[PDB]
Ligand binder design. Structure first.
Ligand SMILES: c1ccc2c(NC3CCCCC3)nc(C3CC3)nc2c1
Ligand SMILES: c1ccc2c(NC3CCCCC3)nc(C3CC3)nc2c1
Ligand SMILES: c1ccc2c(NC3CCCCC3)nc(C3CC3)nc2c1
Ligand code: NI
Lengths: 311, 313, 310
């Protein structure tokens, strides 16, 4: 029985990435409603599936410490290209320090909240895992979504490894979710109505869009074109589209709007629609408001306010 | 006879009957002094003493048990509450109604409630005497809880029957209608600290006796539907739409009734993003905010308000 | 050069004003966006410049302790009666905070809740000049920065006074000094940006068009409405900066500066929307707080501002 590593337990299996806590705070990012695959299995030691490998992540004030679980290879530390993966996943080329400052210069309200909530950045997620994760997110909470994605992976995705009493499965491919008994199984796993959307969307991306290459096209396509493309999918509206756009298709300006963004905007910015009334048009107006205020990284600024308003 | 004291748990161990009441179904320190009834006081820590009908009680609680004692009088032999007297509490605290059934329903329709409710479990509605509630709430307009608590005592002393003394506290029942309808009622009331409202107390009392006849009518309104009752009470002088909604929710078993004022309006706007679908507070806009909370929360909307009110306070 | 005093270090050089902690809390007043010239060099020991003298201040539950530095100029000694009377007026200690809080609480339920943990928040009576130019540097700016801007502005144009430890102190510049031809370039080199334009222009404008620093004293006598209009005619002085000066230097307690932050508080905590289709709306919000709080509405605002920054 292999067990979840800690930094003091076999430090001969950890590689480091020079990362200030001001740049990245794992405890405000990993289980804060972006990915649902990260668990604090032991204190300050976050374990989760990236691609087809398990990771455990921990950090000091100066460094990001990480180790990978590949029975397969000989027990060893993360390779160079595997460290490059984490660097990209956390989008560390981008300075959060400078973005925080740029947003603070125009938003008095962000200045106060951001003081207490440093190191909140956007993960760069796999489009497929991101799409189905957020189809599961409708009228749902982070704990229930975490449960539905785990069961989904254990039932459809391949087994990678077991660490303690935790079995880790990779995210299933479209074809595994598109099958004739997929909806019926996903309903047994407790997804309710979200079971129809998951199977249906898996089918639509294969037959009607030409499989996962389509999601890579959207990643390169402009924001507005990708958003409209996503909205053609079963169970994917403006909100889920903007979530995927922001977190998986490199559209930092994407601002997902629901009744909770409405609440923040109204209470904290005194925002009202300059129309009639939450409608599709007014939700779009709210998204424009924040883009006009914070600029082309409005979505990353939203991740800081959301992550804060969750504590 | 013997000098009687306020009973605590250690003081009177054989003089306490217990009703199994989960602290999650009733937190006494969030109901008894939260602007519902003004007649309950924490004479010793965790111990609540006050009048029900024409008998003084003391109450306190653990996690599973609601502990209660009765001061019948110096006259009657010193005994523990009878079975019929432990029903009177059960009906007063409307403990038939399940708070976990309701807290869960409100949480399922209202995201905001869920974050508030977690730290304020056990908030329910007392089934008050329609008479007591009405005359307590006519003097409520534009006054805080502490001021009305005094008003209702000095009122109860002057016009109410002396029941018993416990320590240095003289407990009186709530006056009957006749007592308040007397010609000099306004003078004593005006002297006591009550404003022009003294006339409205005397008037509404004299008016209740003039047409209705007395407390028979207030039981007709308790069985009558919300529509008829709210309008009926709004005929009485000093009785607006708010005081009518308070009395309706707290005495006449109208769980749906939502009393609206500037503070409700404040919460509605800040926590729910509410603006009137009409003019830019008003009678119709207040009635709209009432409809809004009914249409969101259900037929126990007044009870939901009570949680947030007692949370805000 | 010399050292920063503590009350326990050299007790001889400290005079004392009777003033309960409830009537004044230095830690909520001295670095809360009124004055940018006081720093807490030692815990409960705030040092800064008034007129052309350096002070350190500390307090107990009933005593405001103070000590003054006239430079190496004269012999070391404790504050005079005059200097104590100067310090009395600066904190406007004639005005009962207990009574104002009582009134505000009686007419505003929100204030009653917020005030509880933020007693002793009163308003300084600043020199018009120091105030005008400190709040010209305030546009699109936060306290920490404005402190720096004003310090560098003072170091560069300020009459030198004394050094206490590492810190060297400077008096506030006069108009003549700030209305100099190469004054903007210097202020731009000290990182004031566009504000440098406004400082020089206003400094020059007052001297020539309005007739010396006398003009600013004439507004302390003048009513709020005339005072506020007069200030808006100055470069880089709009409705908000004018109201700031009026409230904190011109003895108009009813003055309520309105910006986007006051808007958000007003909307969230009072449910305020304009009855309009912003200048006219800014003015309406000012009248709202005057109508709610009364003739010391600016002081009430100061309690909420100093609360909503902790
Ligand atoms: C369940 C799980 C996650 C979320 C979520 N995540 C945000 C998305 C924008 C980047 C930061 C994370 N956002 C929202 C609303 C848009 C605010 N609802 C959720 C419901
Ligand atoms: C003085 C005394 C008591 C109250 C009061 N009591 C509430 C009413 C609903 C159940 C909880 C108690 N409510 C209100 C407003 C409706 C919010 N104002 C008062 C003014
Ligand atoms: C930078 C520095 C100071 C302030 C400031 N100070 C207040 C002024 C009213 C009395 C108390 C202090 N106010 C405001 C807003 C109008 C409320 N903005 C500032 C921006
Ligand atoms: Ni609004």
């Amino acid at each position: 029985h292999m067990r979840h590593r800690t930094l003091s337990s076999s430090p001969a299996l950890w590689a480091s990435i020079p990362c200030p806590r001001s740049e990245l705070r794992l405890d405000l990012v990993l289980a804060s409603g972006q990915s649902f695959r990260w668990k604090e299995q032991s204190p300050a030691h976050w374990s989760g599936v990236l691609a087809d490998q398990v990771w455990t992540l921990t950090q000091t004030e100066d460094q990001l410490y990480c180790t990978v679980y590949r029975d397969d290879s000989q027990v060893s530390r993360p390779t160079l290209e595997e460290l490059e993966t984490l660097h990209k996943y956390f989008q560390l080329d981008v300075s959060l320090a400078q973005l925080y400052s740029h947003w603070a210069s125009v938003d008095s309200h962000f200045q106060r909240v951001a003081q207490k909530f440093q190191g909140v950045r956007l993960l760069r997620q796999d489009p497929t895992e991101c799409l189905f994760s957020f189809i599961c997110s409708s009228n749902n909470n982070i704990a229930r979504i975490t449960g539905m994605v785990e069961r989904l992976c254990q039932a459809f995705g391949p087994r990678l490894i077991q660490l303690d009493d935790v079995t880790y499965h990779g995210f299933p491919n479209l074809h595994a979710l598109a099958g004739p008994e997929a909806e019926t199984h996903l309903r047994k796993l407790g997804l309710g109505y979200r079971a129809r959307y998951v199977r249906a969307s898996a089918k639509a991306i294969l037959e009607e869009q030409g499989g996962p290459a389509w999601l890579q096209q959207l990643r390169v396509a402009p924001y507005e074109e990708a958003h409209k493309a996503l909205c053609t999918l079963p169970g994917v509206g403006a909100k889920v589209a903007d979530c995927i756009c922001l977190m998986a298709l490199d559209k930092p300006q994407a601002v997902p709007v629901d009744v909770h963004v409405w609440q923040i905007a109204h209470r904290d910015y005194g925002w009202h629609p300059k129309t009639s009334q939450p409608s599709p048009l007014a939700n779009k107006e709210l998204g424009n408001f924040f883009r006009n205020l914070w600029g082309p990284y409005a979505g990353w600024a939203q991740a800081v306010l959301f992550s804060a308003d969750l504590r």
